[PDB]
Scaffold this motif. Structure first.
Motif, PDB file in Angstrom:
ATOM      1  N   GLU A 149      48.952  -0.365  10.694  1.00  0.00           N
ATOM      2  CA  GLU A 149      48.295  -0.902  11.886  1.00  0.00           C
ATOM      3  C   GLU A 149      49.112  -0.494  13.107  1.00  0.00           C
ATOM      4  OE1 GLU A 149      45.789  -4.764  12.526  1.00  0.00           O
ATOM      5  OE2 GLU A 149      47.820  -5.200  13.351  1.00  0.00           O
ATOM      6  N   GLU A 164      51.142   2.204  13.433  1.00  0.00           N
ATOM      7  CA  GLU A 164      50.839   3.582  13.666  1.00  0.00           C
ATOM      8  C   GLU A 164      49.543   3.795  14.341  1.00  0.00           C
ATOM      9  OE1 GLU A 164      53.216   6.018  10.007  1.00  0.00           O
ATOM     10  OE2 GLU A 164      51.465   4.829   9.408  1.00  0.00           O
ATOM     11  N   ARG A 165      48.514   3.025  13.965  1.00  0.00           N
ATOM     12  CA  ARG A 165      47.125   2.939  14.510  1.00  0.00           C
ATOM     13  C   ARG A 165      47.174   2.654  15.954  1.00  0.00           C
ATOM     14  NH1 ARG A 165      42.411  -0.895  15.394  1.00  0.00           N
ATOM     15  NH2 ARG A 165      44.030  -2.499  14.819  1.00  0.00           N
ATOM     16  N   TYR A 205      48.656   5.700  18.110  1.00  0.00           N
ATOM     17  CA  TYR A 205      47.819   6.907  18.159  1.00  0.00           C
ATOM     18  C   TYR A 205      46.606   6.636  19.020  1.00  0.00           C
ATOM     19  CZ  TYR A 205      50.426   9.134  14.649  1.00  0.00           C
ATOM     20  OH  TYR A 205      51.515   9.709  13.896  1.00  0.00           O
ATOM     21  N   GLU A 206      46.108   5.322  19.046  1.00  0.00           N
ATOM     22  CA  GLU A 206      45.060   4.811  19.872  1.00  0.00           C
ATOM     23  C   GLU A 206      45.379   4.931  21.387  1.00  0.00           C
ATOM     24  OE1 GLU A 206      42.880   1.089  18.871  1.00  0.00           O
ATOM     25  OE2 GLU A 206      43.269   0.554  20.923  1.00  0.00           O
ATOM     26  N   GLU A 257      47.433   7.193  22.792  1.00  0.00           N
ATOM     27  CA  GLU A 257      47.360   8.599  23.113  1.00  0.00           C
ATOM     28  C   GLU A 257      45.943   9.258  23.293  1.00  0.00           C
ATOM     29  OE1 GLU A 257      49.579  11.217  23.839  1.00  0.00           O
ATOM     30  OE2 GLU A 257      50.654   9.357  24.480  1.00  0.00           O
ATOM     31  N   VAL A 258      44.946   8.735  22.536  1.00  0.00           N
ATOM     32  CA  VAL A 258      43.526   9.033  22.602  1.00  0.00           C
ATOM     33  C   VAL A 258      42.991   8.664  23.926  1.00  0.00           C
ATOM     34  CG1 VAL A 258      41.145   8.571  21.747  1.00  0.00           C
ATOM     35  CG2 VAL A 258      43.065   8.714  20.141  1.00  0.00           C
ATOM     36  N   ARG A 312      44.943   8.221  26.734  1.00  0.00           N
ATOM     37  CA  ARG A 312      45.762   8.820  27.799  1.00  0.00           C
ATOM     38  C   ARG A 312      45.392  10.274  28.012  1.00  0.00           C
ATOM     39  NH1 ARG A 312      49.944  12.408  28.856  1.00  0.00           N
ATOM     40  NH2 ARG A 312      50.637  12.800  26.635  1.00  0.00           N
ATOM     41  N   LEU A 313      45.223  11.088  26.962  1.00  0.00           N
ATOM     42  CA  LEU A 313      44.892  12.504  26.855  1.00  0.00           C
ATOM     43  C   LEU A 313      43.556  12.902  27.471  1.00  0.00           C
ATOM     44  CD1 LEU A 313      46.278  13.217  23.227  1.00  0.00           C
ATOM     45  CD2 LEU A 313      47.243  14.115  25.369  1.00  0.00           C
ATOM     46  N   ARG A 314      42.545  12.032  27.364  1.00  0.00           N
ATOM     47  CA  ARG A 314      41.157  12.210  27.770  1.00  0.00           C
ATOM     48  C   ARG A 314      41.109  12.457  29.218  1.00  0.00           C
ATOM     49  NH1 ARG A 314      39.263   8.641  24.807  1.00  0.00           N
ATOM     50  NH2 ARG A 314      38.121   9.922  23.123  1.00  0.00           N
ATOM     51  N   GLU A 370      43.733  13.359  31.249  1.00  0.00           N
ATOM     52  CA  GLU A 370      44.527  14.493  31.667  1.00  0.00           C
ATOM     53  C   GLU A 370      43.742  15.756  31.632  1.00  0.00           C
ATOM     54  OE1 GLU A 370      46.786  11.870  32.390  1.00  0.00           O
ATOM     55  OE2 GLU A 370      47.629  13.828  32.997  1.00  0.00           O
ATOM     56  N   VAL A 371      42.745  15.911  30.697  1.00  0.00           N
ATOM     57  CA  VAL A 371      41.875  17.059  30.844  1.00  0.00           C
ATOM     58  C   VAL A 371      40.958  17.044  32.061  1.00  0.00           C
ATOM     59  CG1 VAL A 371      40.027  18.221  29.505  1.00  0.00           C
ATOM     60  CG2 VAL A 371      42.125  17.490  28.244  1.00  0.00           C
TER      61      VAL A 371
END
Lengths: 98, 98
Positions: free
Chosen positions: B30, B32-33, B36-37, B39-40, B42-44, B46-47
Motif C-alpha cells: 500500500e 509503494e502504491r 507511485y500514485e 508521481e502519476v 505530478r508527471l501529467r 509537466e508534459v
C-alpha cells in the motif's frame, strides 16, 4: 462451563471476519500498485517524445511578466509562450538561446 | 458438549491470527502504491507545462472604426483581426504591441 465457551466462540468469529475483509481490500490494492507504476513509466515517455527532434532555434528577446516569455524564432514569427518547472528564471536573461 | 464448543472456538482464533499476519505485508504494498500514485499526478502536469501552447505576437499597425483592428503580425503579413472585450480599441493605438 458451556456458557463461557459459547461467548468466546462468538467474539473470535467476528474478529476473524474483520480481519479477513481487511486482507481482501489490501490484496486488490497490490494490483492498483502495478497499474500506477505502469502509468509512472508512461508519462515519463511523453517527456521524451517532446524533447526529441525536430528542434527549432529560438532566442529569448525578453521576458514578459504577464507570465509569458518573448521568443524570436529563427524561422520568423515572434510568439509569447509558457515555461515549466524545469526552467528557471535564473537561466533567463535577454538574448538567451533556447 | 464443552468439547464441541472448544474445537469451533479454537479454529476461529487460528484463522484470525493468519489474517493478522497477511494484513501487515499488503499494507507495505500500500505504501509503494501511495508513492507511485503521487508521481502519476505530478508527471501529467509537466508534459502540459513543457508543451507551452502559444499565442502569436502582432502590432496594431492601423485601427479601423468597424470594430476590426488591422494588425501587422510578427509573421510578416498584415491581417484583419477582431478585438476582444477584455482589451478595448479605446486602449489600442498605433505602435501598441499586442
Amino acid at each position: 462451563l458451556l456458557e463461557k465457551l459459547k461467548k468466546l466462540e462468538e467474539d473470535y468469529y467476528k474478529l476473524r471476519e474483520l480481519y479477513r475483509r481487511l486482507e481482501d481490500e489490501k490484496k486488490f490494492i497490490e494490483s492498483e500498485r502495478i497499474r500506477y507504476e505502469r502509468e509512472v513509466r508512461r508519462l515519463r515517455s511523453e517527456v521524451e517524445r517532446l524533447r526529441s527532434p525536430p528542434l527549432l532555434v529560438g532566442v529569448v528577446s525578453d521576458i514578459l511578466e504577464d507570465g509569458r516569455v518573448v521568443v524570436k524564432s529563427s524561422t520568423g514569427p515572434k510568439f509569447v509562450v509558457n515555461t515549466s518547472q524545469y526552467i528557471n528564471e535564473e537561466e533567463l536573461k535577454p538574448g538567451a538561446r533556447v
